[model samples]
Target chain A: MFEQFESKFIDCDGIRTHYIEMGEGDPLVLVHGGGAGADGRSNFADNFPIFARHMRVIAYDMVGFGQTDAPDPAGFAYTQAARTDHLISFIKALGLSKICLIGNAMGGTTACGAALKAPELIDRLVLMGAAVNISPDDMVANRDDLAAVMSYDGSEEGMRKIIAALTHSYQPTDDIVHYRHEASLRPTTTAAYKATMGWAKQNGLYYSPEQLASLTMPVLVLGGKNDVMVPVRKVIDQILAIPQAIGHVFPNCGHWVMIEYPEEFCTQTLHFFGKL
Target chain B: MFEQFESKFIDCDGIRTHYIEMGEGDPLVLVHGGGAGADGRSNFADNFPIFARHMRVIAYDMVGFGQTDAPDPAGFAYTQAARTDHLISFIKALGLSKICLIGNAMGGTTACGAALKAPELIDRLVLMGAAVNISPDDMVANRDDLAAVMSYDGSEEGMRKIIAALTHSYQPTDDIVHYRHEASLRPTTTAAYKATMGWAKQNGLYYSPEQLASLTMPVLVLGGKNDVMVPVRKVIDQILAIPQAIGHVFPNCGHWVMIEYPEEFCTQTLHFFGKL
Candidate 1:
């Protein structure tokens, strides 16, 4: 657990959210996904010091995720758009300028949306395992595993299933699963996840081609070749759509690239940002 | 890692060995098994506070394992007897009176030997996943798994195989494997393990029937029904032979009872000594 990390929160429109900030210099915000144990720390804790050593590292929980405030449907829909709005609000609450950003899965999708909505605030982008270009055909083929991410049964077994879908060869021990599983088992956690995931299935994890073509900033798409949610073809499609985008697919990895290859990911990340 | 637990060392002759000491009450020493990452912490660290909450807790690493000094064949054989000798010397160095002890697998066998050797020092004893009273037929059937314990090839793949033989359902993540795998890959770690295992294979894990019958302290034999190394019959046999012994077989468990069934192991242990 990244329990020892410097963590705090701010009110993003009455959402008593949690977040991480460390190091100093220009800002590079880390974004988390929308699955069991989808929190700022779970996604980027290990790799924080690497980036934080050179630049200010920032990350926060989404509307219905982790330690972030998740209001009922009356207050929010917990949709993909809902999460994006909260992230943008979170950025505004911190009073940040144009910043480089990296996100994984749904958070990556949210990052795309955020960049799309506010081209003024973003400098560059990196998307890891984001379902940026998956078609309806792809969804039909991988429905069960896709649905499992959003509709986990709130049990230890559920975490195992999620881990299976998220990893290639890395076998997660009880210690790893226990931490995430306990987090997912928290009250109202499952309900919030379901609503967020429902939105993802209804709308896709992609923006319109016109919006993708409109992007002027440099983009880097990263994904695991074995990633079921964002397969190589989808990663290629995302890269192809953005004239400024380039990418790499780690052959042996699954959904979580930062975890499977921390050092390499860090090196690639630093080089991409031209900050190394 | 339980880096926060109070740890120190003692000079049992030329060896500067490590041990843990905490809490305050009647003394309860936890003995660890001989495997990759075998140490006072790996085997019993998580369970320390629970026992320490009510009683004094003591545990130490065997030679050639963890931070403990590992002498070559010239100074020590790294034999089963050698490890038990270190344990006995560790206890004597501490200058402790009668104490309750619990051990798993190799440590269990070691505790049985120590209790058999120094009856006056032990008050109550527990044997979990100990290969006690397994017949020649049992050894023949389980030769590969048996040798796998002592003869692992210091690889990540090797740890996976070890875990397979050790547990029934617990899927270890890279966090767990990385810890033990890295430990096993240390300089001379595998060699020391092989020597200890060589002695174990040459002799059996069982004490002689006379020695089993001679145990004067209240004894508890525990094992997982799914445990391939120490099967249910072996546990039952150990329990039946000792006049003052009773035992339990956990259905959904494996070789590491203290690990897989921590609370139950503690409850059975405390009850055996009538401490709770």
Candidate 2:
């Protein structure tokens, strides 16, 4: 289904990178969540096509997720810092400049981190269901879904469950489940997840409040009122912490607002980018 | 697979009750969780047959879940109090003078409520992954999983996610998924869930600490260390609240400890009942 979008790969740092690109304008990179069944295609496949018509849209798989190189587990920690470092390297490798980064969940954390690390490269930032400074205590609301995501094994049934937990209204079809199940079984999938999660637990999964507050880039914090994965309060926390961030909560929506309400997600995003 | 267990139904407080029974001895009634795919069979089918070898085991679909008659939405409130009333009446109608009631998650909440409402009928109380006094703020650890369970839409995919969230190591099979999918689509499943969940949210889903402390029965609280639906802290809270309650935390387990470790669950339960 995503074959129409141009597939591209590059040596991002030391690992082989996979990304989908479209259009011919300012770069808009969509970063995906970090969990089982998450990938560039699964995360932004629906929006990137539409986004491509208006701007240069690039959605890529991170080190541990999707078709991106799953580097040797011994060499990777899969922490946000490492992932963010790789993303920065990817941007530099591709010669993409003045990029607008749209991130969801773990992706959001990385975007913010990237903005902090290399503010010169980022033009704007849009974060949805972003996992900012989510400590164990912050998981009070969606622990069941979080545990399910954490304990997910590479099974078709497990993938189906992960997909359901990702959104409020986005139903998982058999095809979707099958696709994710296959993706989850890739040899590097488990190792990547293990390393990433292990690193997250030991070192924490987000940027500090002071660090987040330092970013001056215009930011849009999007959240789902009913989002379990990233509680609405956490989204609000992001807005409060970031110096130039505004927030919006979609009522009756869950974590995958971009997927659950793609039209609105895109419309608002475009407006934020001054394209609409 | 549950066909081996005899199916029976009777009128209980105006609602037709559906239950599975085995063996012939003192009645040990099992109450299932109150959610999209949770039913007596789905909840206890794996353990009841074994438990029946020592005592009569009866696992029944609660009013708002499973094969039981989902009374018209207008005629039912589906609140914990109402469900407890139905459970108490069901035991009486079955001519079981003294019964041991076992409940998981919402079923656990109802069991606690029933014990309080009619202490004379219940011989013992066993709660696993139960929710008691779980206010919104208490969910700082797993609001995601809680929201997922509450917002479930009875879809096949939704059931898969619920099942996954319930267990730490137990991998859901295709057959299991199919069975739950079919059960979730039963004519009254959605309405029953909506009615029950609506009441729960508005009235709060659990008993107060003072109310919980009122229970004087031999109560056994079983918990999963990795339980996302009901964190172990909540289990400890229940233990602290109940005057005569003893608690156990199963390692490498999630909300569905009974299902995930049926043999141990059964053995511990029997030991608690003086059967082991």
Candidate 3:
């Protein structure tokens, strides 16, 4: 049904990467979070149509996620820094010079690292529920949400629970839930998910306030007040660190902001990028 | 009338600098603008009584302004960069290791330049109608307001027009206008005024976007929408350049924001600096 969209692949750091692209203007890239059943297509499928009307939109799955090559423990630990390196390579290999990055959760952190490392390459930043200052206590408190997604046993029922917990009111349809469930059941997907989480916890993938402050690019920080994993308060610190950053919070919305309020997400994101 | 404030002077770059100190806490320095009849006391008198209740509020006169010793034509050009050097020396001379700078108009520009040069010394920044990107064209366009203050021949009426043109609705009283008139009549004050403006026109003191981007300290950018000199639109650019900057606009205020909205200014400034 979505055949109108082009599904493409490219070699990044010796790994085959998957991505979808549409529209025809300045490049805008979307990266997904490290959640169960998460992939660039699943995370931003609805958003791509709206944003594509104005600019060239590309949503790509990072290593160890979606249809991309899954490098196991010996090959890659899927560390935040490692993911950021892949993103930069993806942009460079595609010959994209000026691009806008929109990232959520861990993806947001990856985008921030990428922007700081090569400020000359990024034109703008849009961070949703980006990770920062995650205390051991916060992880303990949010273990329920964590356990549900991390311990997914490759079942449809497991995917439904993850969606229900992530979104405030938005319900996942049967087709969407089934699609995500099948992806999670892929032979290598479960190991990749577990490895990524273990690496993040062991290394505490986070950016210092100084590193964040060095990102001198136009940024829009969007968060949900009721975000279960990373609340609005946490997002405020990130916004305060980035000097040119502006923040917005949607009431009653949770971690899945684009899913819960697609219209607001699309319009505001486009407006900040000056596409609308 | 203001006996509670202790007036003092220190040798800055071989020039005697005048300043007032009151209250007791972390050092919070106030630098006045370069407008006609403007001095640290005159620009911040109404504000000191309130702000002094907390921090050690010190307001000082820049070179060629107020009671500070005016250098002759051969001694100093009174350029923006020259004034910035004096501000840096003033802080070091006072033995202040930790300081928050609050500046208006040219003072704000001085504060920005100082912060960028030595981010480690500045704890926080508060800029009001701070000058940046000023060009010969801006001066030419604002000649009506500029010419009034620059060509004043020690007249109260000329002072009124300058004040009226600078603010949105705040009116200057008979006593205030007369006070400024007498100060302007000082032989050195008139020479200082012409010298500073002449140097600025010839040199075009301005900070590029890259210089502004280098500032990593927490900054509060406040401006009045009705300001004819440095409008809020220009302030937005500054906000966008600094990685950790936030902005607030006073609706019915102008170049004289500290005077027009003292209550909001004090509270917001204190809150940003973690004082209130």
TM-score (C-alpha, index-matched) for candidate 2: 0.50
Error of 1 at A206 (Å): 2.0
Runs off by more than 4 Å, candidate 3:
A1-276, B1-4
- State the lDDT of candidate 3 residue by residue for A11-115, as single tens digits: 998978999998889999998988766888889888988988999999988888988888876666777878899899999989997798999988887888889
Q: Please report, in order, the local distance difference test score of every candidate based on alpha carbons.
A: 0.77, 0.79, 0.79
For model 3, what is the error of residue A50's alpha carbon versus the real structure, in angstroms, after optimal superposition? 36
Better of 1 and 3 by TM-score: 3
Please state the error at residue B249 of candidate 1 in Å. Answer: 58
Candidate 3 backbone collisions, by pair: A242-B243, A243-B243, A243-B244, A243-B245
DockQ of 2: 0.01
Return the interface RMSD of the candidates, in order shown, one decimal each: 26.6, 18.4, 11.0
Scoring the B chain of model 3 against the true B chain gives a TM-score of 0.95
Instruction: Give the TM-score ranking, best first.
Output: 3, 2, 1
lDDT, candidate 2, B123-156, per-residue tens: 8999988876777565544557777677886677
Docking class of 3: incorrect
Question: TM-score (0 to 1) of chain B, per candidate?
Answer: 0.94, 0.95, 0.95
- Candidate 1: residue A244 Cα off by (Å): 0.7
